[model samples]
Target: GSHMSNISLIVGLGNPGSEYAQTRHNAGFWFVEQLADKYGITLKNDPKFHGISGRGNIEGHDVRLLLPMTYMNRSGQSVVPFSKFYQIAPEAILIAHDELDMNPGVIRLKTGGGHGGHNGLQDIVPHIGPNFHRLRIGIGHPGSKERVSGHVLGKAPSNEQSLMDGAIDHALSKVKLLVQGQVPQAMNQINAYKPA
Candidate 1:
C-alpha cells in the first residue's frame, strides 16, 4: 500500500483468471495467499505494476508479496517494475512456483538455477538474471510433454491438493527463517516435512 523499500519480496507466479484457478500452475499463488492470511497482509491490484501486491512485516523484515497478473510467460513484467521502484536486489527476492519434477507434498528451497522450461522462471531470468532465490512447490508432472500444458492448467483432485496444502503450511512455518537469509536452515525443515 505504502511506498516499499529494501525487502524480501515473495513472488507468486501464475496465470491470471479463474481458468487457472486451483490448478497446478497456481501453486505459487496459493503460497502467497496463505502467507497473506497468516501475516495479515491484504493484497491489492496495482495496475502500474500489472499485478496484485501486498506489504507487511515478518519478524521486522519489510516483506512484500506479489502475484503477477501477467501470464506465466510474462511474469517479469510485473516483478521487475516493483523491484526496481523499491531498489530490491535479485538475492532479496524469492520466486514461488510449482515444480513439475517433484511430487505433491514436496517443497524445496534454493537460490539460482536454469528455469528448467518453467515459463515463469524463463521470463523472469532475462529481466533480473538467475540469481534470485526460489520456493519450489511440488506439482507432480503428467509424464508426457504433450500433456504438460493441459495437466498444469487443469485442476488437481482434492486429495492431491490436500497433500500440497500440508506442504505449503510447513513452508509457511519456516518462512521467517527464509526471509532472514537463513535459507539452509529453512530448507532443513522444508525438505523434511511430509503430509499424512
Candidate 2:
C-alpha cells in the first residue's frame, strides 16, 4: 500500500425505509450508523441531496456521513449534489458497499476497481468513475446467479448475522485511523482481524 487514503465524503449505500434496515445490502448503512454514534452525529434528511446526512470532525478533520435515499441502482442521484457543492474528487470519496464474493463477516478495503455487478456501483461509476475507495463489507453470495436478487434483500442465518456483526465491529475500531488519513495503518488493522 502506497499510503492511507484520506476521505472527505463517506457514502453508505442502502435503500431507504425500515424494510431494508436488516437486508444484506444495508451493510454500509450499518457502518454509517456506527460512525454516527461514535461521532455523536445525527443523520437527518436533506432534501437537496435526497439522502440522510450528518457532519462532524474526526481528529479535527471534517467528514460527512451520507446514506442515499434513492434505491441501490440510482445512488448517484443523492450523492452528486453534495459532492459537487463541496468540490470533492472521486478519489477522496469512500463508498461502503456489500460484497457478494466474500463470505459474511469478511471485510476488505480497496481503492478503484470494477463494480462487480453491484447495481449501486453500476449507477455510481457512470457518474463519478471508479477511483473512489471502497469499503467492501462482505454479505456472502447466494451460491448461484439466479438467486442473487432475493439473497441480498433477504436475511442471513442467525449465526451468519452474528459473524457479520463481529466484522463490522472490528472495522469500526479502525475508523479513526482512516479519518486521520492513516490509510495503510487502518487497513492493516482492519484486514488482519480474524473471523469470529
Candidate 3:
C-alpha cells in the first residue's frame, strides 16, 4: 500500500450508436479505441458488462478497457456492474470523457474530482462515488451553456478534428507511465503538450 496504485479499469464515456461515432462527445470513445488498438487489444461487445470490453496488459500490468453502451447519461449502469464484478475500486478506475472547458488540442489527467456537470460523470459519481481518476479530453465549449448539447453532439471542423487526434496521440505516447502508477510524471508529460 506504500506505492501509488496502478489503474485496473479504464472506462471511456460516450453515447452508443453510429450516429454519435464522430461527434465531439465521443472523444472518450476515440481515445479508448486508439489505446486498445495501440496495445493490440480487441474490444468486443459484452452482454454482461453492457459495453464493449477488453482485457489486456499495459506495462506488464493486467488492465481492462470499457466503452459503455448505456449512453452518456446512463454510464453508471455499465460501469458499476462491471467494476463490482471485477472487484475493482473507485481509485483504480480511470474515466475518460470529453471536457468542455479546454480547447480541442488539450487534455488533462487528474484524480478525485467533481463531474463538472457532465451527464455521464454526474451519473457515475452518484453510483460509485468520486474518487476515480479522470482523463479529460478537451473538446472546447460552445460559448454558451444553451448551445452545449448541440455543440458536443455535432462534428468538429476538419482542423479541430486533427488537433483533437493529435492530442490523444500525445497522451497515448505516455500511457506506459500512467499504467505504471507514475501519475505525477505522466501528468507532467501529458499536460505540458501543446499542439502546433
Candidate 4:
C-alpha cells in the first residue's frame, strides 16, 4: 500500500524503567538519546504511545523520535500508534536496534530482512510491516544459548564500554543522513565508516 505521508519516525527499541537502562539490549535507546541530545531536544513522556518522544529538525527535515516503553518484546504496540497519529510511512520509519549477528563496535543499515530471533523486531514487524529501515548495532552473540538473555540484559564489560560509546556517536551521524531522506547514502556511510 502507498503511504499518504512522508513524516520520518525514528524508533529505538528497549525495555522500560531504570532497571533496564544501560543494559546491552538497550543500546538502541542509548543511540536515540544521543541523537536527541545532539539536536538539543528532550524526550517528553507521551502516554498515547506508552513511550517518550521528541520532535526536532534534522537538516531542515522534521523528525519525530521515539523510545518505546512497551518493553523490548512488545515494542510495536507503541510504534503503530505513533505512526498512525503522525501519519508516517512505514518506509520513513527508522528503527535503531541491537543485533547479535555482528561483533561489538560494528553497525549496519538495512531496509528489510528477517528478524533473526530478535523479539523486539518480531513484534514490530507485524504492526509496521517489513518495509522500515533498520539501524542494526552489533552486540555480538553470547558464548552459549543459555547466556543469550543474560548477555543482552547485562551491562557491557569495562573494555566494551568504549566501543558502545563510539557506536552511539556513529549512529547519531547516520541518523542525520537518514532524516534527510538519504537512506542509500546513509547505508554507504555506515557500512564504510569504521569507528576508531
Candidate 5:
C-alpha cells in the first residue's frame, strides 16, 4: 500500500459490551458503527488490542476502525499498541467521543485540548499525545453534576432518540470527508449542520 494512502486509524471511545451499546457514553462507538455499516465492514473482535477492528476504504483512502474493549477509562492501553504497530501518526488519528458540555445534535472537531474531565479522552491523550483529531458528539450536560454518570450511562429519553440518531448519521458523513483529507470542509459542513 502507498504511504500517502495510509490513514490507518480511527478510534471510537466507548465502554465495551452490549450493555453499554445504547447509552449516551457510547455515542462514539455508535457513530463509528454507522460508518462501518455504510462501508460494508464488520468490527470483529481483535484480542491483540482488547477491542474490535475493521478495515475499509473511505473515499478511496485506506482506513482502519477501532473500538476499544478495555472500556472507556483504559482506552489508551489499546490505542498505543495499534498506533505503534501500524506506525500511525497521532496527527492522522481521529477519535469520535461524547462531550457533555455541548448541546445535543451538536458536533465539534478539534485538535489538542484538555480532556475536560472525560476519562476516555484523558487516557488517550497521554498515550497517543494530544495531537490527534477529535469528533466530539454532544450529549448535553446532566441536570446536575451529581447526575452525570447516570446520564451518560443511561438510555436517551424518548424525545432525544431522534436527535441522537441524526447526530450519529451526521458524524458518519463527516468521517468520510475527513478520510478524504477534507478536514476543514468536513468541520464546516458538520459544525453548521442542524437536526430537524
Candidate 6:
C-alpha cells in the first residue's frame, strides 16, 4: 500500500472494428471513450502508436489515453511501443480491461497481478511487466468455460448493458483521483460503488 503510482498513460484493451464495438469484450473501449468524452478529448489513430490516442490534463496532471488497435490477443504490440516511445514506466500506466469473474455492473480497481487468463492481459504482461494499475470492468462469466468466447463477443441484454454503463459512470467519477496518484482513495470510491 505504500507503493507510489502516478498515471501518465491509460490503456483500454479491446479488438478493433465496428463489429466488436458493442460486444461485452469491448467494455474497456467503452470506458476510455466515456473518459475521452468527459475530458473533451478526441482519440485519433497514430501509426507509431498502433492505436488511437489522445492527451489531456486531469487534476493538473498530463494524462494520455490509448486504445490498442492490434486486436485483443496482441495488445502488447501496441502498448509496449507507445509506452517505450513516451518513456513511461509500467507503474505509471493504468490498463482497463473487461473482467469475466465478476457480474455485469461490478467493477474493481486493482494493482500488479497476473492476467487472470485474459487474452489482452496475457499478451501485455510479458512486455510491460505486471506493475501497472488495472481497472477491471466486469462483464460477468458465461456460466461455463465453453461458452466464454461467445459470451464476451456477444452483446449484453439491454438491462445488463445499462448496468455496465452505470459501472463505467462510477469509474469515471473517480478518474481525477486516479490521475492524481490517490489510488487508494480512488479505489475506495470506485470499488465501493454498486450499480443497482
Model 5 bad stretches (over 4 Å): 1-7
TM-score of each: 0.94, 0.94, 0.96, 0.93, 0.94, 0.96
Question: In candidate 3, where is summed lDDT lowest over 10 consecutive residues?
Answer: 1-10
**What TM-score number comes out for model 6?**
0.96
Ordered list by lDDT, greatest first: 6, 3, 1, 2, 5, 4
Where is the poorest 10-residue window by lDDT in model 1? Answer: 1-10
Q: Write the per-residue lDDT of candidate 1 for residues 1-101, one digit (tens) a residue.
A: 22222228999999889878789999999999999999998999889999999998887777889999988899999999888998788888888999999
What are the per-model C-alpha RMSD values against the true structure? 2.7, 2.7, 1.8, 2.1, 1.9, 2.4
Q: Whole-model Cα lDDT per candidate?
A: 0.87, 0.84, 0.89, 0.83, 0.83, 0.89
Considering only N, C-alpha and C atoms within 3 Å, which residue pairs clash in candidate 2?
A: 4-183
Q: After superposing candidate 6, which stretches have Cα over 4 Å from the reference?
A: 1-4
Candidate 2 per-residue lDDT over residues 1-196, each given as its tens digit: 0123577678899888899899999988988898789878789988889899988886677888889998888898987777777777777788898999988888987889989999998888888788888889989889688999999999788888888889988887877777777777877787777784
lDDT of 6 by residue, 48-117 (tens): 8789999988778888899999999989999898898888888889899999988888999999999998
- List where candidate 2 sits over 4 angstroms from the true fold: 1-4
Winner on lDDT between 2 and 4 is 2
Worst 10 residues of 5 by lDDT: 1-10
Q: Model 3: runs farther than 4 Å from truth?
A: 1-4
Candidates 2 and 5, the one with greater TM-score? 2
lDDT of 4 by residue, 1-196 (tens): 2232232788898899899898889988988888888987789999888899999887777888999998899888898888888888788888888898877888888888878888899998877789888889888889998999999999888767677678768767767677767788888988765667
